[PDB]
Design a protein around this ligand. Sequence first.
Ligand SMILES: *[C@@H]1O[C@H](CO)[C@@H](O)[C@H](O)[C@H]1NC(C)=O
Lengths: 439, 104
Amino acid sequence: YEHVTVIPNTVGVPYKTLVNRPGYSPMVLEMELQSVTLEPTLSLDYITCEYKTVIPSPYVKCCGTAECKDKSLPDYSCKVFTGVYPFMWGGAYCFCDAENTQLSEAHVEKSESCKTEFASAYRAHTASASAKLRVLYQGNNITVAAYANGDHAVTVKDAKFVVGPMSSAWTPFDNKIVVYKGDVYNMDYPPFGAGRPGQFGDIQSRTPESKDVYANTQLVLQRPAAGTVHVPYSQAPSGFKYWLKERGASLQHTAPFGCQIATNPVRAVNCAVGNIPISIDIPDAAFTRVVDAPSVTDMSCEVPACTHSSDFGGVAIIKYTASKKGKCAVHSMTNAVTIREADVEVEGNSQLQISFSTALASAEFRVQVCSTQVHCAAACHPPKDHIVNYPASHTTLGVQDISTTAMSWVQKITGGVGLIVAVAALILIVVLCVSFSRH
Amino acid sequence: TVPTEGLEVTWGNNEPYKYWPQMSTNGTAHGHPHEIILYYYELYPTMTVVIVSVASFVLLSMVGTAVGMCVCARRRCITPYELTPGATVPFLLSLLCCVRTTKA
Ligand SMILES: *[C@@H]1O[C@H](CO)[C@@H](O)[C@H](O)[C@H]1NC(C)=O
């Protein structure tokens, strides 16, 4: 047998789905979402890290002049100066008072630290869904894992489960993302080869190991301090290290629906959006012919007390009489109320208790068991607490709601005098019809 | 202030705490004194209560057209009179009292 259902995309909220098959006892299964993982694409746009500035020993000269020869290196720069008269510990370096010259040059390269610490920019666009389910089958909890895209089919305990596809294509991610060691950020990185100094992307590297790099750091030299031998540099401050200082809030806090985000691999998990379709092919072995199930008769219901709450605040006692000892499923056919229990053993002329959750001020509903219906009417009361920690979406109430006793009040209010006014209009128009024929 | 859909707070490096609303108050209650306005305010505030406002104005509208029919019946009943030359209703205005029953 094949059964298809749909459930809200929520985690930790048990769901009852009643599959019925003529000629056999109908059975209701409990399905729970352990977690749902969304794996986005991974197109590594590039990486970046802190840079090291290499400035070899400056070239000094006397009574002669140096010269700049271009170097095919990133952001390589050079300069010359004249008239410098450096002094060392033992005295002047050389005699030429002003005929001397100084040549300096520098460049910037990647740091070995990049091999361990860095920030990587990807252009992830799409994603795939995988999920974990817990199912109450034959009186035991069973775990299943499958891709929640409507394609993956999984066989367990002789039954075939298919999940997905996700109703909503929404994702918390973005086309372009930047990832640190364990943090993710939605942020539009500058295009490769156009890094703006002092900002993210100031140095661009294709890979942590690729020797080729790109840089933009305005490396300008300056005239050295008089009387000293040294190289000054106007090295641009590293925007990469700085961006780590102003990273801002991570996406695990800014993600709508709070989809928890992990790494290695990067996934977004546990966000409630849309719903999921599930198709279950269940072999008939689990199915039991109706004759096998014990009968039921003399059904009475009572509610000693009930309390509409996020928990199972409602308790109902039912008196039942059955043919023989045996298991029997229990369900509520009204979505406004949910029942924690799935089935129960029935011996005969006995009673039982059931714990349920509702949201109506007055709970008036039918309950199905052993292919029989029993009414239940009660007046719940508001609990004391206004907010709770654990989640509970079972007790969902639409705009339609039970006015309870006040229902009668509005039923009494609905009475109007339109009938009498129409009667008066008819009477006047007829007594006029003596003179009013067809106008 | 919690929203109807829940709110989560992260404190330091400790695991975040989740709070989502439950029903508001016990102040509302069903009984001989209506006390339902509190029901429909505490639960679904501003909803199912402005609905009562629209119900109010529409019921005012039906009663308004009812008094309209009253005046229409008044004019319709006096019109066949329209000060007839006979000027007599011993069995209608003396009994039905439709309009200006002071006279006849
Ligand atoms: C299934 O999970 C529930 C959750 O609390 C647990 O109480 C029960 O013992 C588990 N096993 C069953 C229902 O067979």
